[PDB]
Curated annotation (Swiss-Prot):
Keyword terms of this UniProt record: Cytoplasm, Isomerase, Nucleus, Phosphoprotein, Rotamase
Compartments reported by the entry: Cytoplasm; Nucleus
Other known facts: Present with 4590 molecules/cell in log phase SD medium.
Gene this chain is encoded by: RRD1
GO molecular function: peptidyl-prolyl cis-trans isomerase activity; protein phosphatase regulator activity; protein tyrosine phosphatase activator activity
Job description of the protein: PPIases accelerate the folding of proteins. It catalyzes the cis-trans isomerization of proline imidic peptide bonds in oligopeptides. Acts as a regulatory subunit for TAP42-associated PP2A-like phosphatases modulating their activity or substrate specificity, probably by inducing a conformational change in the catalytic subunit, a direct target of the PPIase. Can reactivate inactive phosphatase PP2A-phosphatase methylesterase complexes (PP2Ai) in presence of ATP and Mg(2+) by dissociating the inactive form from the complex.
Family: Belongs to the PTPA-type PPIase family.
Enzyme Commission (EC) number: 5.2.1.8
Effect of inactivating the gene: Sensitive to high hydrostatic pressure (mechanical stress); simultaneous disruption of SCH9 exacerbates the effect.
Protein name listed in UniProt: Serine/threonine-protein phosphatase 2A activator 1
Domain of life per record: Eukaryota
Reaction catalyzed: [protein]-peptidylproline (omega=180) = [protein]-peptidylproline (omega=0)
One cellular component (GO) term of this entry: protein phosphatase type 2A complex
Quaternary structure note: Interacts with the phosphatase PP2A-like catalytic subunits PPG1, PPH3 and SIT4. Forms a ternary complex with SIT4-TAP42.
Organism: Saccharomyces cerevisiae (strain ATCC 204508 / S288c)
Length: 307
């Protein structure tokens, strides 16, 4: 099935590398793995379009395992000011951060999950542990972001998010993007293009407003305005991503983000931005060898099998 792991016929084991060449990039195109990723990408995008207006002060969901996952993310957050910038390209305190992360994270995910599900930790630990960038190269891109979506897809396949709402994906991904921005700045990470680091923010941000399109607080062309974008950054992912680019990049916008600029200037409806960016996702991340290279496969969540 695409939406559930067949519990408990299923077996979980340490994720392993599979994509290494061209033929293997297309084997991927017809694997249970890619179809599970795609199913969840579409589910989250759809769920979040019902949430044009999340509460920016919300701390909690009434879904237990969203709270659970927030906590593990909170624990990783405080891990940073225990691992302060060395000087220096990516900074090297990051290696230490990742090492502290890799040490404590299986413990954390055991605390987070009920007893029944503990065998799942080797696979979840890999997926969550690869969401925050590369230890050796010290960079962050769309493959790490994918692996944070892989993480939540995997909890979802275990039936941990029943009646998952748009507001629960905003909350989860919102905590996640606040940590990422925090990292990038603190440990000066390198770009691993639409955006130097991200691709889902914009699928999700444009989907938040795709159902209201004409009465959206902002139209696509309005994103070129720096201060309108400030006012909506807490409540809309698209603004949040563009507002980060404004703060970390110093050319005029057309110069440093030509692809986002060419979309703002040319796509008049949010439902169109979303679907365009979705199709780009298949090509610029799912069919891109330098990205999907480092997505590893286990036997339970995202298996290397046909059909």
């Amino acid at each position: 099935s695409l939406d559930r792991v067949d519990w408990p016929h299923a077996t979980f084991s340490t994720p392993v590398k599979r994509i290494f060449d061209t033929q293997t990039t297309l084997d991927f195109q017809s694997s249970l793995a890619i179809h599970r990723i795609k199913y969840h990408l579409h589910k989250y995008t759809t769920l979040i379009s019902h949430c044009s207006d999340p509460d920016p002060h919300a701390t909690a969901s009434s879904i237990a395992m969203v709270n659970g996952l927030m906590g593990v993310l909170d624990k990783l957050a405080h891990l940073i000011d225990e691992t302060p910038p060395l000087p220096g390209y990516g900074n090297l305190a990051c290696r230490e951060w990742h090492h502290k992360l890799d040490e404590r994270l299986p413990q954390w995910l055991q605390e987070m999950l009920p007893s029944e599900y503990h065998e799942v930790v080797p696979e979840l630990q890999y997926y969550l542990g690869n969401s925050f960038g590369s230890s050796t190269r010290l960079d962050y891109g769309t493959g790490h972001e994918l692996s944070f979506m892989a993480t939540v897809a995997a909890l979802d396949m275990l039936g941990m998010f029943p009646h998952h709402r748009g507001a629960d994906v905003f909350l989860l991904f919102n905590k996640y993007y606040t940590i990422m921005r925090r990292l990038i700045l603190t440990y000066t990470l390198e770009p691993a293009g639409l955006d130097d680091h991200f691709h889902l923010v914009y699928i999700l941000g444009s989907s938040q407003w795709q159902l209201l399109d004409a009465q959206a607080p902002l139209q696509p062309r309005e994103i070129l305005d720096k201060s309108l974008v400030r006012e909506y950054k807490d409540t809309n992912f698209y603004c949040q991503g563009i507002n980060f680019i404004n703060e970390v990049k110093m050319g005029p916008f057309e110069e440093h983000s030509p692809i986002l600029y060419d979309i703002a200037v040319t796509v008049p409806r949010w439902s169109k931005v979303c679907k365009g960016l979705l199709k780009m996702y298949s090509v610029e991340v799912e069919k891109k060898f330098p990205v999907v290279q480092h997505f590893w496969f286990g036997t339970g969540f995202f298996p290397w099998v046909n059909i």
